[PDB]
Amino acid sequence: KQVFNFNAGPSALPKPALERAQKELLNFNDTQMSVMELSHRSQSYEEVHEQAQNLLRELLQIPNDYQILFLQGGASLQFTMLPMNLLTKGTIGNYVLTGSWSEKALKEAKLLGETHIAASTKANSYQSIPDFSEFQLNENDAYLHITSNNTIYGTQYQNFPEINHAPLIADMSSDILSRPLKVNQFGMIYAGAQKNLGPSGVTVVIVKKDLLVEQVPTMLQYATHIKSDSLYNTPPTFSIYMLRNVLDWIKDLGGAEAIAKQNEEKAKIIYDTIDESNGFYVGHAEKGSRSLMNVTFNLRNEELNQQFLAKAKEQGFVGLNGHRSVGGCRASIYNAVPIDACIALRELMIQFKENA
Amino acid sequence: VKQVFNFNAGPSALPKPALERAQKELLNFNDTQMSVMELSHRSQSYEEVHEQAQNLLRELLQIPNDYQILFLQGGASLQFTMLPMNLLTKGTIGNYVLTGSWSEKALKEAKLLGETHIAASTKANSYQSIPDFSEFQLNENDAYLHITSNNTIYGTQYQNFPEINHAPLIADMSSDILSRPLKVNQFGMIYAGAQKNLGPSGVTVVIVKKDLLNTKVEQVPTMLQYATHIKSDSLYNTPPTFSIYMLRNVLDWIKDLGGAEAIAKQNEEKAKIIYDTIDESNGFYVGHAEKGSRSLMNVTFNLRNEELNQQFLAKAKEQGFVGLNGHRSVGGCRASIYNAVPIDACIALRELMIQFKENA
Ligand SMILES: *Cc1c(COP(=O)(O)O)cnc(C)c1O
Ligand SMILES: *Cc1c(COP(=O)(O)O)cnc(C)c1O
Ligand SMILES: [Cl-]
Ligand SMILES: [Cl-]
Ligand SMILES: [Cl-]
Ligand SMILES: [Cl-]
Ligand SMILES: [Mg+2]
Ligand SMILES: [Mg+2]
Ligand SMILES: [Mg+2]
Ligand SMILES: [Mg+2]
């Protein structure tokens, strides 16, 4: 009954968080009701809601002048909500393209206003993060948007640019809270929970308050949610409960620095395996841009790729097929993927290479 | 432990077997050794759940084949703007029937986007009834006519639905969807946040006439187009998988009890227990709704003054009752008695109400 969950989104969750959820699923906090059966205006729910925010604040050390929002719609809705709120006439939504998710965000902005590409590694099929000295910025930028971890391509920002002419905005869906962050570098950060933080259904938005509106639908104004503490309408209460639970697990293991140590060890196991394979496995990313969250690689040809992924699946590994747009293989090693799973993957990779 | 009676208005009581089923397989769903929360929404295990939730709805409400069932995020509140964004085009009018606060919120969002009209309204008499369909002021350039089937805050409910042929009839059915049989082809679109009568928060059910809305609307953000979700079968981006799973489990329970027709029978009986208590109270309890409009889902009432209101609600809370306080905008009391609220909770409430009255 061996299963190794390398799913890319939704993804593995910490066993203690799921076990805690199971145990109190019918009787939350001695109320004799599921957390799912509580009113979102009840104090019982309100404490959970606030506890999830508090844990994020603590774990990412989010300053007081930032607010933490829990929204629905996924990171995908943020792609349009952001320009809807910030891309005012005579300003420009400026994008750094480091993968296909970058492209999807830029597409939504083009609907609503003037856009620009500050830099892009598309020509080289997104094998790296561009040098910050190469960015083309504009006086009238409304924001600079980046994708911190390029989920499909397996590359990741090592650090972030020092931007002062406009707010820096980041889609951190696939690496939020996988390492310490300097939140003050950003005007806004957003992430679907379903990779590193919890189950699908909630989006975390960390926003500089004073940063962010005539004619925008009520539900699509950040101001609505800031003003109502993300309780303007009914929030995804069970997803926020599970987010709380995952955050308690991260706190319990030592926080963002401790989880970074685990994550770096996980990625080290896979990349070392690839690098020591003498070209049998080939990583897509340039070394300097290698993601710690999604490891992308291929075998020497499509038929070996296929034989590998078939053997993987038979041995209990789940989610290793690369994104359809790029093929190959992708090992997603988000926070809750245990080191034992990556070790198992290594051992499978080594045996397959030997037996080919 | 002591008794708990769950009259919460949204999210609300779930049927125990749906929760017990979720609890038992929470760590290992369908023998995959993963939680349904840990699966890819492209996995066959998830797709099965997603398809079953749709098929159960189709069968239970008898939805026609030219309608599609969408599972969206954002709540009913997001539908308030998505609807006029897709259908309220230039030169057309969003026509609304106002029968409570939720109707006003819908209208307000359309006013942001286009020409609106009010076909009829009971706002003047504080939304104690559903207006007569004969009073509906209709326009030839209406993009749709929008109603609220159950007015959650005021406790009133449509007994039946108007025949509309000049425009699509649209209904917010958040608080009474699948509480009774429905003739879906009366409508162009029905929407409901799931958390009142269908399951957990986090997913919104939208039943849509495919040809009214499977076409691209120029200038509308991809996520805000119905077309997007119709084309991708609600898998355009990552769905709320656990919410949809729980929705499936709740729909299975409704089917297991005999479907919409059987649940309507149960719902009328529960409601009768409370309204008869009110009606035999000689004015000690006063229902907000006029009798012909009384909701079967949300029973709204007041005692003779605010002091007695507060003492009644304090006593209830002390006796284990949860969620009876009226909506903050109107005060008084509100017994929400959605599908999964058990009839012995209603009997318990009656008992409370009668001893409070006798002892006051
Ligand atoms: C998965 C992902 C998204 C899509 O998120 P949804 O919640 O499915 O909208 C957006 N950006 C990145 C970087 C992602 O990895
Ligand atoms: C609760 C309610 C809503 C709001 O739903 P959200 O999911 O909170 O947006 C809308 N309409 C009716 C009739 C409701 O009862
Ligand atoms: Cl990408
Ligand atoms: Cl992806
Ligand atoms: Cl109402
Ligand atoms: Cl309500
Ligand atoms: Mg702890
Ligand atoms: Mg080495
Ligand atoms: Mg059954
Ligand atoms: Mg009982």
Residue A171 forms beta bridges with which residues? A147, A190
Determine contact, residues B356/B41, Cβ cutoff 8 Å.
no
Length of chain B: 360
Q: How was this model experimentally determined?
A: X-ray
Coil vs helix vs strand at B333: strand
Contacts of A341 in chain B (CB under 8 A): none
The phi and psi torsions of B261 (rounded to 5 degrees) equal -75, -40
Q: Is B133 exposed, middle or buried (0-12, 13-18, 19+ CB in 10 A)?
A: middle
Decide: A208 and A190 in contact? Cβ < 8 Å: no
Residues with CB under 5 A from ligand 6 (ion): B 152
Q: Domain A15-253, what fold? A: Aspartate Aminotransferase; domain 2 (3.40.640)
* Domain locations in chain B as residue ranges: 16-257, 258-360
Backbone angles phi, psi at A203, to 5 degrees: -120, 130
CATH number of A254-356: 3.90.1150.10
Told to judge if B111 belongs to the known catalytic residues of this protein, a careful annotator would answer no
User: Token digits for B9?
Assistant: 């208005």
Which resolution in angstroms does this entry have?
A: 1.8
Bridge-partner residues for B223, per DSSP? Answer: none
Q: Minimal Cα distance from A200: which residue of B?
A: B240
Write out the H or E segment, with its range, that includes residue B57. Answer: helix B44-61
CB-neighbour burial class of residue B178 (10 A; exposed 0-12, middle 13-18, buried 19+)? buried
Q: Beta strand A188-192 with A168-171: parallel, antiparallel or unpaired?
A: parallel
E strand or H helix at A79: helix A74-86
Question: Which residues of chain A make contact with B39, given a CB cutoff of 8 A?
Answer: 7, 10
Question: Coil, strand or helix: which one is A268?
Answer: helix
Q: Say whether the peptide bond before residue A10 is cis (omega within 30 degrees of 0).
A: yes
Annotate A87-142 with DSSP letters as a single string.
--TT-EEEEEE-SHHHHHHHHHHHHHSEEEEEEE-GGGTS-SPPPGGG----TTEE
- What fold, for B16-257? Aspartate Aminotransferase; domain 2 (3.40.640)
How is domain B258-360 classified at the CATH fold level?
Answer: Aspartate Aminotransferase, domain 1 (3.90.1150)
If residue A74 lies in a helix (H) or strand (E), which one and from where to where? Answer: helix A74-86
The residue in chain A having the minimum alpha-carbon distance to the alpha carbon of residue B197 is: A37
Which among B99, B152, B247 is the best mutation to test ligand 2's pocket, defined by most ligand atoms within 8 Å of the CB? B152
- Nearest residue (by CA) to ligand 1, atom 5, is A75
Residues comprising chain A, all counted: 356
How far is the alpha carbon of B75 from chain A, nearest alpha carbon, in Å?
A: 7
CB of B117 within 8 A of CB of B137? yes
Chain B interface mutation, best of A30, A33, A232, highest count of B Cβ atoms under 10 Å: A33
Answer whether B243 sits within 8 Å of A201, measured CB to CB.
yes
Pairing relationship of beta strands B150-151 and A92-97 according to DSSP bridges: unpaired
User: B257-262, long-range: CB within 8 Å, 24+ apart, which pairs?
Assistant: B259/B60, B260/B60, B260/B61, B260/B178, B260/B179, B260/B180, B260/B181, B260/B182, B261/B180, B261/B181
Helices (H), B257-339: 259-279, 306-318
